[PDB]
Amino acid sequence: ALKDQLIVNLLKEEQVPQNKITVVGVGAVGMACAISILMKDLADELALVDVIEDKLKGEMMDLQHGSLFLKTPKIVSSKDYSVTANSKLVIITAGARQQEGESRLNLVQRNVNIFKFIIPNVVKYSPQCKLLIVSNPVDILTYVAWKISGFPKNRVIGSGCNLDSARFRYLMGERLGVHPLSCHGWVLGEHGDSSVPVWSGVNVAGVSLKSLNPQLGTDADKEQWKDVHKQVVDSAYEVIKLKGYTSWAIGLSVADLAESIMKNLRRVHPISTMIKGLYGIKEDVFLSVPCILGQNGISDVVKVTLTPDEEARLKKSADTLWGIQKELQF
Amino acid sequence: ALKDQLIVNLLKEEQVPQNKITVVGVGAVGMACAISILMKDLADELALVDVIEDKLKGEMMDLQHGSLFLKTPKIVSSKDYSVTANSKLVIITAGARQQEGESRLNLVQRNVNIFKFIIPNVVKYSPQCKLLIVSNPVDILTYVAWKISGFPKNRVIGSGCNLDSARFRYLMGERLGVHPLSCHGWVLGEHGDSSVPVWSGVNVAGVSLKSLNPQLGTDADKEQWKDVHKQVVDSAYEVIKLKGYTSWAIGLSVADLAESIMKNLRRVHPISTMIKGLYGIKEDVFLSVPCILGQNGISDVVKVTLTPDEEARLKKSADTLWGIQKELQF
Amino acid sequence: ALKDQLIVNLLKEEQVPQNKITVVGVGAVGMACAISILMKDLADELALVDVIEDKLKGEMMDLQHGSLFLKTPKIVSSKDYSVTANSKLVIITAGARQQEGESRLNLVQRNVNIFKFIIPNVVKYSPQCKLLIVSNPVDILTYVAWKISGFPKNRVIGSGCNLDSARFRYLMGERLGVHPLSCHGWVLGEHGDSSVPVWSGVNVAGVSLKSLNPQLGTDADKEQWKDVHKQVVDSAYEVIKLKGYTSWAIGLSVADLAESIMKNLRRVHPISTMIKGLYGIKEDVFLSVPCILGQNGISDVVKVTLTPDEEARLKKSADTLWGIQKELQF
Amino acid sequence: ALKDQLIVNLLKEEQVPQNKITVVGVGAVGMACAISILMKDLADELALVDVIEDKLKGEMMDLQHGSLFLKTPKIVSSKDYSVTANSKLVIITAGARQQEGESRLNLVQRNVNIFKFIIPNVVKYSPQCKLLIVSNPVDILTYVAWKISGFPKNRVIGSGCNLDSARFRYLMGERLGVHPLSCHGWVLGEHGDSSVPVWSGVNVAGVSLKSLNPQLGTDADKEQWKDVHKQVVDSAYEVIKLKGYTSWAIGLSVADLAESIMKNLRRVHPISTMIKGLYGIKEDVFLSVPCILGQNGISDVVKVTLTPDEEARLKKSADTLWGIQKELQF
C-alpha cells in the first residue's frame, strides 16, 4: 500500500482528545458557534450533533472541506452522543426559536422537553465537560440543564447576557465614537425583556457617565440613553424581522465564552448562574451577573453594587424568571 | 452633550479606509466570506451590497452586534454602490447559485446578465480595486468581469480551484493520516466537472506519490486514487444535496485568497486567470493554474510541467469552457 | 534562468508597501517591538534602522530567517533612512538607556541630540507616517519629536503610560484572581517616578474598588494597595536590577499601540500627548492621559474626572516634566 | 477583605493547567521560544527554569508585565523543577552555546553534564511530558535526553533541521520572488555542517526545480544553488558573528513545533529522531528526517527517497554523529 510505502508508523495508541468541544444543534446559531470556534483555534476536535441526518452530515462535510485553512484536525458528527465523548465543553444550541412578537419565555415547554433527552445523553460521555447553554429562554434552560444534569452549578453556564452587554457596548461606542473594547457597561438579568442596564457602572476610562449626567438612563435624560437599552432588548427581534433569525453575533459571543473556558482566562462575563443569596433573592434563580469564567466554569461571582432602583429592577427580573421556574414540569 | 463633557475632540478627520473590503451578495456564500474575513482581521472596513433591503440590513446589524469580538471597526451596508467606495478588494458572490443535480455551468447566462449591472457599479466607486469573482461558473464569470470592467487582467481574479485543491489536500490527508498542510497537490482547470488533478506533482515532504505508485490517479491504479479527484468534483453536489448549498469551505477559501491579496504575501494559489498562450490555447479562456497572488493581484504564473495526459485533460477543460463561453450574449 | 523557466512574469514589479512599519533602534526594546509586531501581523513590510552596521545586519537576518513562520513578506534594514520610505508607522526606540539608580529624565540631553538627527530623517522619507516615541524620557521626547518633525500633534504619540497601566492591571488581577483584561485602572502622568494612579477609576465589572474600601491607595489602607503603584513605579528599575534591561513588556505595549493605529481601532490608551488646557496646565507639557488612538493617531482625549488628591498629583507630574523641558535647547 | 467584598468564591479549584509549557533556560534562545509561544497562545501556563536566580526572576517579571496583551494567564519561574509540574511539553534550551567560529559539536560534554541534572528533574515532575530538545548539538542531546529520561522515543524530539529548512525556503523564496510558504524543500540529517539538502524534493507548486535544471545543487549549476545550502549551513555562524548569537528564527521554529505538538496537527517537520532501520543505519543515531508531529510527539516517519549521493551524504551525517554519541559518559 502507498501509505506504508511513504510512511513508517512508529506508534500505535491514540489517546483522548485534549481540548474537544461539542456543539449540539446545527441550525444557524449552532453553525455560527462552530465557525467562530474553529476560527479562534480553541479546539483540537469539534463534534456536531443534531437529529436531521442529511443536514448534519452536510454541515460537517462543509467544515471539513475548509480544514486546510484551519488548525482543528478532527471534525466529526453523529446523531449518537457517543461522538461527543471526552468533550471539555459542550454547547447546547438546540430547540425552538422565538418568532416575531413571541417572548423567549414562550419557548420553555418545547425546549424543556428537548433538554430531557439531550442533557443526559450529553453528560454521559464527557466527565470533564462544562455545559454551556445557548438555547432560549437561556436562563430558565440553564437552570433546567443544571437540574437534569445533576452537575455542580460551576459547570452549568448560560450564554446569558454576554451578547446583550456586547450590543450595549457596541451602541455606546457608536454614540461616543469609541471602540466597544473601550466602552464599559453591564446589562444583567434575563436575556430577554426584563434585562437591567447597570447605569451606575457605565464608563469610559474609569469615568462614570452617570457622574457626568445623573439623569443617564432615566426618562429625564435629555440624550435618552435608556433607548440604548431598549435597542438591546429589541435587537434579536429587529434582526429576526429583517433576516429571519440571528446567528453571527451570538456565535461570536459564545465563542468569547468558549475562549475564557478553554484557555482558563478568568475573565469576567455577564452569564447565567445561580444567584440565590445575592440582592433579595432567596430562591434558586438563574440569571446573568458578572462571573469569573475559567477551565472549571464559573468559580467566582462578582458582587455588583447596585443603586436601589437597579436592584429593584434586578429583583423584578429575578421574580419573572422564578415565576417560569415554578411552571417547570420535570 | 454627554460625549463632549467626556471627550475633548482634537481632529475632525473623516478619514478614508485604508484596507477596505466589499462583499457583493449576502447569500450563504457571501456571508461566509464576510465572517471569515472579519475573523482573520484583514479589513478596517467591511461593506456589504445586495438588492434585498431587509436581508442586507439584518446581516449587517447581526455582524455589527459582534463588534466587541472583532477588530474591524466599521461594518456598513447599502443597495447603493457608493457604500463600496475606496475598496482595495471587491468580492463578488452574487447571482443564481448551483442547484441540486445541476452543473455550475447552468447558471451562466443569468449571472452574465447580473454582472452587466454589478461590475460597472463596482468599477465606478473603486476603480483601482482588485476584483475577486466567486459567483458560478467562476471561470467564465472572471472572464466576463474582466471584459466588462476594463481592468488589466492582473486585477481580475477568480476563486477558481483554490477550494478544489483544499478539498483534495483534505481528502489526501485523511487517507495518509497527515494534516492537509503537509499533503501537497494541485487540482487545476475548471472549478467544476472538468478539473484536472496534477498527479505528477502530488507529494508529501517532497516525495512524489507517483514515484511510489506510477499508476497513481489512472484506471490502472490498484488504490483508485482517481476516486479522490472524483470526490473533489462531486463535493459541491453532495453538500448541496445534504444541506442545500455550500458556504463554509468557500468562505474560508475566499478569505485565504483575500489574505494573500491584502497582505501582499505572494503565495501561490490555483485560481482563475487568462490562460491564452499556454498549453496551445489561442482564446481568452480563464481557468485555474498556479498563480502568485499579491497586492497587485496576479503578477506571475508558475509553469506547471504536465504529462501528456494531464495536458490533454487541461486542454479539454479549456475547450469545455470556451464552448460555453463563445455562445454567450454579451 | 531557472526563475524564468519556473515562472512567467505577467506584471512589471513596482515596490510600494501599503502597511509598512519602521523600527528605529535594534537594542532590546526595538527588537521586542519588532518581534511582537511581526507576530501580530500588522505590517506588510518591516524596516530596521540603527547606526551599528553588524548588529543591524545580524538582527535583520535573524528575523528574516523566521519568514516561513510569519506573514510579513519583506524585512529590510539599513543605516540609510531611505530604507524607511513610505512607512505608515515609525517607532523610535533609539537612544541612551537608564542605568540602575538613574532617572529616565537624566537621558534627556543625550536623546534630544540624537532626535535632532533621527526625526528629520524619518519625516523625510515617510510624510504620511505616525511617529511612535518609545525612547525615554518618553513624554519630553514626544514633545521634542513634535517640535522637530513639523507634524501635527495627533501624529506624534508617546508609548507613555500604556505599560505602567498594563503593570498596574497585571498586579491588580494577581491580587484579585481575575484576568488583567477584566481589571480596570489607569496610571497617568509621566512614564516614570511621578506617575499618578487614578484610584477613583479602579474597578472590576464597573464596581469601584475605592467605594468598597475608601482608604484604597492611602497609607491607611490595611491591604496597602499603594504598594501596587509603588511596584509600577519601581518595575523598570527592579527588572533592570535583575536582567540588565527591560524588553518584553514594553515591546508588547508598543505592539498594542501599533495595532490600534494600523487597524484604526479607536481604543483608549494612556499615552503621551499635549495636555495644555486640561487640569489648569498652560504650557506645552506632554504626558499620558487616556487618548483615542486610530489611523490618524490621537484624535480625542478623555477628560478623566479626578479627586483633588489625584488632580494635584497630576499637576505635580506636569510641573516635574516642565521643570526639565523648560530648559531644553535644540 | 477587599477581594472578598468584591467577589464571592464558589469552589476551591485545583489550578492544574491543561496546556502547560515549560522552557528550561532563559538565555537568548529560551526567551525567544517563550515570547513566540506566548504570542501564539499555545499554553495556559508558562514555567521558566534556570540557575541564575536574578536573571530568571527578571525575565519572568518582564513577561508577566505584558499579561494584559496575552492569553497565558499564569507565568511562573523557579530554580526548582517543582515549578514545571504537569507540563505537556518541556523545551530544553539550556547549556553552553556556540562562540563565534565554534562547531556545535564542541558543546557536547558540557551540555551532556548539564543534561544529567536537568532531564531527571524534568521527568520527575512531568513524567508524561513530551521533551523538545533545542540545546546543541541538538541531535546528540536528543539521544542523551532519551537515554536519561527513559521515555519512549516518540516523546523525545529535537528541533533538528526545522530551522535549517525554514532558512532554505526563505532563501529560495527570496531567489524566486515567492513567499517561502509556497517554496518547498527539505534539509535533513545533522543540524549543522553535515546537513543534507534534498534537491530531488525542492519544488514550487509541485514543479521540481531539479527537473527544470538537471544540474541544480551541483558544482556544475550555472546559478550555483548549492550556495543556498552553503548559506543554510553558514547562517548561525554568520548571525553569531554579526550580533553575538541567534534567537528569533530559532524561537519561531521551536514555537511552530510546539504548535504542532500542542494542537495535535500531525504536520510534517524535519526534526531529530531515532532513525535506526533507515538508510542502512544499524545504530541508535538521532538526526532529522521528515516526521509527523502530534500530541504524542513523533508518531510516524516519512520515508524520503534520496539519490545515491544524497543517501551517502546522510550516512556521512549519521557516522559523524554516532562517532561522538557512542562514547558519551552518563
Ligand SMILES: C=CCSc1nc2ccc(NC(=O)CCC(=O)O)cc2s1
Ligand atoms: C425528545 C425529542 C427531541 S431530542 C432533540 N435533539 C435535538 C438536537 C438538535 C436539534 N437542533 C435544533 O433544534 C436546531 C434548530 C434549527 O434547525 O434552527 C434539535 C433536537 S430535538
Ligand SMILES: C=CCSc1nc2ccc(NC(=O)CCC(=O)O)cc2s1
Ligand atoms: C435587476 C437587478 C440585477 S443587479 C443584482 N445585484 C445583485 C447583488 C446581490 C445579489 N445577491 C444574490 O444573488 C443572493 C445570493 C444568494 O442567495 O446566494 C443579487 C443581485 S442581482
Ligand SMILES: C=CCSc1nc2ccc(NC(=O)CCC(=O)O)cc2s1
Ligand atoms: C549623534 C548622532 C547619532 S544618531 C543615532 N541614530 C541611532 C539609531 C539607533 C540607535 N540605537 C540605540 O540607541 C539602541 C536602542 C536601545 O538600546 O534602546 C542609536 C542611534 S544614535
Ligand SMILES: C=CCSc1nc2ccc(NC(=O)CCC(=O)O)cc2s1
Ligand atoms: C552541571 C550542572 C548544572 S544544571 C543547569 N541547569 C541549567 C538551567 C538553565 C541554564 N541556562 C542556560 O544555559 C542559558 C545561558 C545563556 O544562553 O545565557 C543553565 C543550566 S546549567
